[PDB]
């Protein structure tokens, strides 16, 4: 039946997307250091299929790791625009989540969500590299639960 065929196509495409999540080298602050430590041998992003890649044209997930300030927010929004779809935003740290320590400052965006649609909120100051890996795996399951071709079949 057509539903089974589109189901299997959904599983294949979602598996590819979740098993080759290519992130972006967009570290901003101390939350980037853990972003490096999970790339360090101990946790090693590489075994999970995730390999760092600059040039947003060839990346899927943006881990906004660090404080997002007013002077940088236009750059972050523009760079998010460069990403071809599908795209995902993982927010690392309290600063990139809702403001963190400098939530009441004059030149800090009170949450990265106000600029891009954040897909996964990873809490911490900074989050432990295990916690960030957990957030990435949660995003992976999110991609696994996508129903693109199913919705197309029931257009």
């Amino acid at each position: 039946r057509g539903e089974y065929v589109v189901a299997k196509l959904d599983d294949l495409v979602n598996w590819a997307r979740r098993s080759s999540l290519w992130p972006m080298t967009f570290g901003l602050a101390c939350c980037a250091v853990e972003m490096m430590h999970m790339a360090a041998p101990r946790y090693d992003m590489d075994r999970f299929g995730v390999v760092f890649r600059a040039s947003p044209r060839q990346s899927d997930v943006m881990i906004v790791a660090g404080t997002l300030t007013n002077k940088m927010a236009p750059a972050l929004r523009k760079v998010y625009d460069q990403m071809p779809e599908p795209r995902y935003v993982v927010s690392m740290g309290s600063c990139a989540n809702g403001g963190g320590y400098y939530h009441y400052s004059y030149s800090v965006v009170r949450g990265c969500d106000r600029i891009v649609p954040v897909d996964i909120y990873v809490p911490g100051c900074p989050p432990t590299a295990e916690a960030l890996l957990y957030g990435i795996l949660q995003l992976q399951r999110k991609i696994k639960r996508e129903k693109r071709l199913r919705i197309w079949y029931r257009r």
């Binding site: 989540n97 996964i120 295990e130 916690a131 949660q138």
Partner: protein, 176 residues
């Protein structure tokens, strides 16, 4: 006491210069560089098998905030507002009101995880060990609003991680 890190003049004996020319032509330190990486590939990798294998922690680890309670069942919090008055990020909001029994307990105890800095200052300030930073750190959420913790959510965390948090405090209270 100081040392000259790069103050070495190379010897100009015929043997020395022959060795330098051999290293230049027949790449020698380059071969050493290859050999080092060969030696480490043959070595054991350091990666752990997350999530089936977890990196080591300590009983002092700071994670998800949680409200504890006495063994009787009554909450430890008495709304003294030390944690709210000491939080560097002003992430705690407390509203108190005398309960029906008479004990002073928070009618609202909200901790904003999206604004928290996980310093642990609240758990030091608490005179009754009511608010603690639990061992949990894998509590990422898909939406922002789920990170704005209420009193009920914090009490649920306290009731859930109580087995771990009681042991962690038991193994660390003597240092404090």
């Amino acid at each position: 006491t100081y040392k000259f890190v790069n103050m070495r003049e190379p010897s100009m004996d015929m043997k020395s210069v022959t060795d330098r020319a051999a290293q230049t032509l027949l790449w020698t330190e380059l071969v050493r560089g290859l050999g080092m990486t060969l030696s480490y590939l043959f070595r054991e990798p350091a990666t752990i098998n997350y999530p089936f294998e977890k990196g080591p922690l300590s009983p002092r680890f700071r994670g998800e905030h949680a409200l504890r309670r006495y063994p009787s069942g009554e909450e430890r919090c008495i709304a003294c507002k030390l944690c709210e008055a000491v939080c560097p990020a002003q992430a705690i909001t407390i509203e108190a009101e005398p309960r029906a029994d008479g004990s002073r307990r928070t009618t609202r105890y909200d901790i904003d995880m999206t604004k928290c800095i996980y310093c642990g200052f609240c758990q030091e300030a608490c005179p009754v060990d009511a608010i603690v930073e639990g061992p949990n750190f894998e509590f990422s959420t898909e939406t922002h609003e789920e990170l704005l913790y209420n009193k009920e959510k914090l009490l649920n965390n306290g009731d859930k991680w109580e087995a771990e948090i009681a042991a962690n405090i038991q193994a660390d209270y003597l240092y404090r």
